[PDB]
Symmetry: D2
Subunit: 486 residues, 4 copies
C-alpha cells in the first residue's frame, strides 16, 4: 500500500531487482500485472505464447503468496497508462517500481508511461533485469554503437567491470490488505482452443520453479558436450529453456554466473571439451543480448520489425501454397518434419528454423510477412527482437551469414543436422523404412527401393510441389529484380 511493482516480462521472484528493492524499501508492496495487448499494435502476443502467460501467472501467485503479499492483481484496459494510473489511485501508492524492456514498441511506451505518472505526482524508478549490461554503456572505440556481433561480444566479455551478481531473493514481504483493490480474472486463450492448448503440456510446463530445474538438469547433463551436439536436431541436448528465458522466468545474470562458476571446475580437471562448450554456450546467450541491443540502438528496426534490405521481390500470392506449407504436404521431408514439430510442440530447433524458413522464401517464394505472422502465432519464444534478428539472419541480411542466391538443397543440408535420420522418422512415420540415403530426398530415389520401403509417391507421401532445379533458377529470375533497382 506504499509502492507498487508491476511485472511485464519478469515473471519470477528470484533475483528480480524490482521486488527485492521493494522489500528493503520499508513500506508495504503490492504486485500487479496490467494486460493491454491492444497497445502492442500488430504484435498482439501470440496464440500459444498467450497460453504460456496464463499458466505462468497462476504459477506466480502460489509462489508469491508464500512470501506474504496477499495476491497478484491483474487489470485489463486498452493502454497501460490509464490502467496503471487507476491502480495507484485505487490503492493509494506512492512509487512505481518497474524495469525497462527493450522492444521498440515498449521503449516509446515506457517514456510515455514515465511522462504520465511523474506529471501526476507519483515517482517512478526503472531497473535492469533481463540483460547482462545495459545497451548504452557498451560502446565501441569512440562513442558509437556496433554494427556486427563478433566485434560486439568481444567487448562484452572484456569489460572493465564484471556484470552484477544475482542479488538475494526477498525474505518476506507484506501487502497489508488483499481486498482494497478489486482484482479480476481475465481471459488469455480463446474458448474454442481451451482444450487444444492444454496439449502443449506434454512437453512444456511453464513457471519459474521449473526454470531452474530445467537449468540444473542441463548443467549436469548436456553442457559437457554442447560443443559437438549443437547442430544435431535428433537428440534433445540443446537446453530447452528459451521460453523460460523470454518471459523472465530465468535471469540471464544467473545463467552467466553458474556457467562461469563451473567453467572453472572443468578448467582444472583436464576437460578440454567441457570448457570449450562453456564459451560457446555463453556466445549463444550473447546472441540474445545482442538482439536487444540492436533494436534499441542505431538500426532500431525503426517503425516495424521484419526489416533489413528487401520487400519488392515478385512473390506468388497463392494462399493454397500457404495452406500446404502450414500443413506439411510439401514432399521435402526435412522441412516437413520441422513443420510438424512446430505444430505439435510449439518449438523448433535453431537449425530447423534455418531450413523451414529459408525454404519458405527461396523456394516457395512467398512474402516474408506471411512467415512471421505464422511464426508469431504458433511459437513459444516469439519476441520482438530475436524473431526480427533471426529472420534477418537466415533470409540473409546481416553481414553475419546465410546469404541469398543459395537454396537449402537438403542432400547435404541434412547430413549436418540429422545424420542417421532419427528426426525424420520420428515425425513422419509413413517414411520409417527408407535406408537413410533417401530419407532426405525420396523423389531422387529409384522405384525399386521405394516400393520395397512401402512408399508410393502420390498416395502415401506427396510429391514435391516445387522442384529443386526449378526454384534454383526461378529464384534467380526473381532475384534479378532486386539487382536492377538497388
Amino acid at each position: 500500500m506504499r509502492i507498487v511493482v508491476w511485472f511485464r516480462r519478469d515473471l519470477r521472484v528470484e533475483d528480480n531487482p524490482a521486488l527485492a528493492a521493494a522489500a528493503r524499501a520499508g513500506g508495504e508492496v503490492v504486485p500487479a500485472y496490467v494486460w493491454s495487448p491492444e497497445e502492442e499494435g500488430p504484435y498482439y502476443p501470440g496464440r500459444v505464447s498467450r497460453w504460456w502467460i496464463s499458466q505462468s501467472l497462476n504459477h506466480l501467485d502460489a509462489s508469491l503468496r508464500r512470501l506474504g503479499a496477499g495476491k497478484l492483481v491483474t487489470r485489463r484496459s486498452a493502454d497501460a497508462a490509464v490502467a496503471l494510473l487507476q491502480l495507484v489511485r485505487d490503492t493509494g501508492a506512492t512509487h512505481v517500481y518497474f524495469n525497462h524492456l527493450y522492444d521498440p514498441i515498449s521503449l516509446v511506451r515506457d517514456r510515455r508511461l514515465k511522462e504520465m505518472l511523474a506529471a501526476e505526482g507519483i515517482v517512478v524508478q526503472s531497473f535492469n533485469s533481463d540483460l547482462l549490461y545495459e545497451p548504452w554503456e557498451v560502446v565501441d572505440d569512440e562513442g558509437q554503437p556496433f554494427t556486427m556481433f563478433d566485434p560486439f561480444w568481444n567487448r562484452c566479455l572484456s569489460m572493465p567491470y564484471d556484470p552484477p551478481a544475482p542479488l538475494l531473493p526477498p525474505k518476506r514481504i507484506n501487502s497489508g490488505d488483499l481486498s482494497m483493490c478489486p482484482s479480476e480474472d481475465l481471459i488469455f486463450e480463446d474458448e474454442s482452443e481451451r482444450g487444444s492448448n492444454a496439449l502443449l503440456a506434454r512437453a512444456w510446463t511453464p513457471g519459474w520453479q521449473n526454470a531452474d530445474k530445467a537449468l540444473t538438469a542441463f548443467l549436469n547433463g548436456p553442457l559437457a558436450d554442447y560443443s559437438v551436439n549443437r547442430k544435431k536436431a535428433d537428440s534433445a541436448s540443446t537446453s530447452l529453456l528459451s521460453p523460460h528465458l523470454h518471459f523472465g522466468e530465468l535471469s540471464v545474470r544467473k545463467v552467466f554466473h553458474l556457467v562461469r562458476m563451473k567453467q572453472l571446475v572443468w578448467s582444472n580437471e583436464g576437460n578440454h571439451a567441457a570448457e570449450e562448450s562453456c564459451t560457446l554456450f555463453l556466445r549463444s546467450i550473447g546472441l540474445r543480448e545482442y538482439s536487444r541491443y540492436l533494436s534499441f540502438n542505431h538500426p532500431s528496426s525503426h517503425e516495424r520489425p521484419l526489416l533489413a534490405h528487401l520487400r519488392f521481390f515478385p512473390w506468388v500470392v497463392d494462399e493454397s501454397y500457404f495452406k500446404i506449407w502450414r500443413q506439411g504436404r510439401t514432399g521435402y521431408p526435412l522441412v516437413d518434419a520441422g513443420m510438424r514439430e512446430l505444430w505439435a510442440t510449439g518449438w523448433l530447433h535453431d537449425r530447423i528454423r534455418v531450413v523451414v524458413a529459408s525454404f519458405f522464401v527461396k523456394v516457395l517464394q512467398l512474402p516474408a510477412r506471411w512467415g512471421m505472422k505464422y511464426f508469431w502465432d504458433t511459437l513459444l519464444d516469439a519476441d520482438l527482437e530475436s524473431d526480427a534478428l533471426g529472420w534477418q539472419y537466415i533470409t540473409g541480411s546481416l553481414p553475419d551469414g546465410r546469404e541469398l542466391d543459395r537454396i537449402d538443397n537438403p542432400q547435404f543440408e541434412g547430413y549436418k543436422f540429422d545424420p542417421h535420420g532419427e528426426y525424420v522418422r520420428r515425425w513422419i512415420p509413413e517414411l520409417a523404412r527408407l535406408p537413410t540415403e533417401w530419407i532426405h530426398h525420396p523423389w531422387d530415389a529409384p522405384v525399386s527401393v521405394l516400393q520395397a520401403a512401402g512408399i508410393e509417391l502420390g498416395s502415401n507421401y506427396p510429391l514435391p510441389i516445387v522442384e529443386l532445379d526449378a526454384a534454383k533458377g526461378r529464384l534467380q529470375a526473381a532475384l534479378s529484380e532486386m539487382w536492377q533497382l538497388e
Copy 2:
C-alpha cells in the same frame, strides 16, 4: 563326427535338450542348420521373419564356437531329407539328435524324415524342447483331446507331475575337424531389401543372449503390474519377447520356472497385485502351448491353416482397398496407427492386432487370406499355429470370444486400449492436437474443434473410405449369406 544335432527352431544353447544330450553322449558332435523353404509350401517363412534368422544364426555361431564345436554348418536344398542324408554321408555320423516341432507341415515331414534315415542304417531320436508338456500326454477325463482353452489349461496346472526343470547347458563340446564338411553361406533376405531390413534394428536385436536380458528386465520391471497394464498399448509394458519365444531363443520351461520361483517371493510379502499378475502371465504362456496342441490334435487345421467355419462371404475383390489398408489411408485413426507400427517395427500389440484385423474383414469386407498373407510377410512372431489360432479367434470362431455381427466401433474400442491417446499421437503426428475426445473419431468432430487443431479432413488427414453406419448394415447384408447356407 559321431552324432549330429540339426537346429530347426531352437536357436539357443541354454537348456536345449538335444545339444546337452549330445555333450554327455561321449562322442564328437557337429551342429547343423538345413534351410529348405521350398518344402514348407505356401508358408515360405516371412520377409522380416527371414531377416531375424540371418542375424540369429550369426549370433549362434559366435556363441557356440566358444563352447568348442568349430562351426555351425548351413546347407540348402529343396527338401530336408536329401540334404540331411547328404550331411551324414559327408561327415560319417551315426546318430541324428533333433527335437520334434508341431506344425502340421513339419509333423508329416518329421515322420517322413524318420522314415528315410532309419531305413538307411542310422538311428534318430527326437526330444521335446519348445513345449511344457507333450500334447499327447495331456488328456481329458476319458481319452479324448480338449476342444476349448479354459478346460484345457486347468489340467495343465494341476498335473500329477511337474514339468521338467531347465537342464544345465553343456560344459564344452568338440567337433574334431572344422573343414571336412564344406559349409556354404546362403542368402536369406533379398538384395533389394538388404538395407531396408536393417532398420528393424532400431527396436529389435535378435539372438539368444538378448532373450534372457529381455526376460530379466521384465521380471524386475513390468511383471509387478502386468494385471492392469495388459490391455494398454501406449506403454511398452507387455514383455516384448515373443520373437525370442517363437524361434526358440528362450525356453518356455525356463519362463515357467522363473515366474513361478518369484511368485513365491511376492506371495509372502503381501503383494496381492504382483502375485495375481503371475497367474495371468502364465495363462498367456499357456495360450502359446494350446495353439501347438490344437494343430497336432483333433482339429489339426487338416490340410491348410486359416480355417474355422467360413470362406463363402461376398468379399470385395478391390485391390486398391488392399492398397489403402496396407498403406494406411483409412481415416479410422486407431487402425491407422496400428497399421503404421506394423510397418515401422514389424510388431503389434495383441489388442491392436485385435482392431486392425477385425476392421479388415467386418468393415472393409476383404477375403481373410489377403490378411494372413500380408501378416505372414511383415511380422516377426509369424508362426503356423498362433497366426492360425489368433485369426480364428478375433474374426470369431473358437467358442472363446470375439464373435461376428459386431463391428469394432472405435468410440469405446479405444478407451480400453488407449485412454489418453498416447498411441495415436505417437504414430500419426498430423493429428497431435485433437483434445483426446475426437482423437479416436475425427469425422465425428464439429468443424470448429477441427480447424482449431489444424486438421482439414481431405487434405491433411483423409476421410473414412467406408462409413461406420454403412458397414454396420452392409455386413449384415453379406453375413445373411452364411445363415441361409449353414
Copy 3:
C-alpha cells in the same frame, strides 16, 4: 495328518526335496522340529549358533503359514526317537519324510531312528538335500573312497550325469487341523544372554528369505572379482552366506546352478577374469561337499572330531593364557583384530581363521581341544565336519597344506591378507596412526615412530606375551617329542 516332515538342518521351503515330495503325495502334511541337544553329546550346538536357530525357526513359521499348513510344531525331549514316535502317535501319521544328514553322530542316530519307526509299523523315506551328489556314488577308479581333495573334485565336475536341478517349491499344502497336536514354545538361548545375543543382528539377519537376497547381491557384485579379492580380509567381498548354507536356508544345488548359468553369460562376453572366478567359487563350494564326504567315508573321524595324527604334545596348562587369547591382550595385532571380530560379529574370514588358530597351537602351545570348544561356542558356521576339516588343515594334517614346524610370522603373513592395514585399524583403533609398516609388528618398531603415533607399549597397547623368536625354537623343543614316538 497323513505324513510328517521333520526339519533338522534344512530350514527352507524352496527346493526342499521332502516338503515338495509331501505336497504331491496327496494327503495332508504337518511339519515339525524336534529339538534334542542332549543326544548330540559334547556337540551341544553352540551358544550363538543356538541364537541363529531361534530366529530362523520363527522366520520359517511366517513363511510356511502362507503356504497353508497351520503351524510348525516344536517338541523337546532327550532323544529324537521317543519324541518322534510320540509325534506320530499324537497326530496319527503314516509316513515320516526326512532327509539324511552326514554327521557321524547323526548317521548312527538316523539308522537308529529308521530302526525304531519301521519296527513300529510306520514307513520312512530319506532324501538328499544339502549335498550335490551322494557320498557313496562318487567313487575313484576301482571301488574305493578318495583320500585327497584335488583327485576328488576332478571326479565331481566330470560326472557322467549332472546334479539334479532345483525342483519347484510347492504350490500350497494343508495341515487340516492346527490344534490336535499340543505344540510348545521352547528356550534356545539363556536368560542371562537374552539381550547380549540380540547385538549380533547388527551384521547378521537369519532366515531363508535373506539367503537368496544375500546370494543375488553377491552374483551381481563381488563374484566378478572373487579370483583376486579372495584372500583380502579388509573388504567384505567374500560372499558372507556360510551361516545360511550351514543351516540349510540356501540349497547347494541352487548355488551350483546359478553360478554355472551365469558362467556361460560371462564366457561369451570376453570377461576372462569373471569366468575364472566362477571355477574358483565352485571349488570352495566343493570344499563343503568334501568335508561331508570325509566324515561319512573311510577316515570318518571314527569316534570324535578334532582328530588327525596328534594329542601328546607338551602343552602349557595355563588357563590365564586362555584368558588372554580369548580377550585379546596378546600384542600380536593381526591375531588380535581377528580375536575381536569373532566376539563382535560371530564371524571370521577364512584366512583370519588361518592365523588366529595357528597362533593358538604353534606359538601359545595350548591344547587344541580348548581351541575347538571356544570356536564351537562363539561362531555361526560351526558344524561338525568343516570345523573338524579346517582345524585338521590349518594345524596341519591333511596332505593338502599348512604343515607344522612353521610359525605364522605376521611380517609377511599380513601383506597377503591385509595390504594397507584397513583391517587392523578397523578393530583396534588404539593403533590407528602407525604408518602401515609397523601396523603388523609394533614391537619391532623404533621408539621414535611409536611415540609419534601415540602408542606406548605396556599401557596403551600390551606387549607380546610370547616372543616370536622364542616360540620359533620353543615349538621345536616340543615338536621333537612327536618325532621320537611316531
Copy 4:
C-alpha cells in the same frame, strides 16, 4: 611484477576478493605465502594443523598455475614484515593486496605490517574475505558492541543491506617471469612424523576443490534433516567442512548464498523440516562469525586466549592423569571413544567436544591450559577464536550455557548424543556386546551381564580412575575456593 597478493588463511581462488581485485587491476600479479610461525608466539599452529597446510598449498599451486601466474612463492623468516619487505624488493612490486584477519595476534601484526610498508613507499589495501559483515559495522542500538549471541545474530539477519554476493573468479592472470624470485621449499611437518601424518588422509583430503565437493554433497544430502540429526554423533550427518572453512578454502559468503538460495526452493514445496534446518545451519555459521567479532571487539581476550572468569582452582598437578586422558585408559566409555576419534581422525563432533573437555576439568580437575595445548596440537579446526570461544562456553563462562557445579553424568549425557551405542562400539570394540543399557556405564552393571558380554573390568576394560560420586563432591570442595575470593 606490479602488485603482490600474499595469502594468509584464504587458500582458494574462487571469490577471493584480493586475487580478483588483482586481475582487473591491469598489471601483473605474483602470489605469495610467507610462513613465520615464530611470530605467532605460543600459537605455533598445530601439529596436524601444520599437516593440512602443506597439502593445501601444493593443491593451490596446481590450481593456480592453470590460471597462469607461474608459481606460488613461499618464503620463511622470523617475522612477516622483514620477509614481505624483502619480497617487494626482490620483485619490484608497487602494491600489496592482502585481506585482514581477526586474531588478536595478527590484528596487532597487520597494523604493524601496514606501518612498515607504507612508510617505505609502497601502498597497501586490505579486504574482507572470511566474514559476512565486518565486525565494526555491526552495532547495537546506540554505538556499542554486543555482549551475547542471540541479541547479536538477530541484528545479523535483519541488516539494512544484504551481504555482498560471491564475486566471480578471475578469467586469467599473469606473473610475467617465474624465475626472478628465488622461491624455496620449506618444511611444515617433522621428519619423525612424516609417515604417521599421512594416515589422516583416510578421512580428510584438503584443498579448495574438495571444499565445494564437500559442500554440494551436504546440500543434497544431510541438510534436509539437519534439524534432528544435529546432536547425534554416531552418523556422519553434520557437514564435515570446518577444516575447509577455517583455512579459507570455502568462503562463508558462498555458504550463506547457496543455503539461502535453496531455502526458497524448499519453502514453496511444503517441506517444513528442510526449511527449519536451514535457519539452524546458518545459526551455526553465525557462531563462527560471532567468535571473530568477539576477539576483535570489547572483550578481545586482551593479551592471551583461554580467558573468561578463572585460573585459581586447586588442580591436581599429576602428569600421569594427563597420560591417561590423552591415551584413554579412563573407564568412562563416552569420553573414551571421543578420545580415540580425536587421535585417529584429528576430528571430533561438537557435542563430543562437549563431554570430553568438560570431563577434563570438572571430574579430572586438571588445569585448562593443559587441555588447550593438547587440543591445539592434534586437531584440524584449531583457530584462535573458536577454540577460545568454545572452551569458554563448555567449561562455562559465557551467559550462554553449560555452567559449572554440574558434572557430565553420562547416564543421560549419552541418550541424547548416542541413542543406540553405535559410536561407542565403533571406537572401543572390546565393549561391543553390552546390551545398550550399560554401554555408557559399565561400572554400574551387575557382574552377570558383564561376564556374559566378555568384559572383565580391570584386564579387558580398565576401571574408572575417578568415581562419579567422588568428583560430584570433590569438585564442590574445590569450587568453593572460587566463591570465597570472587
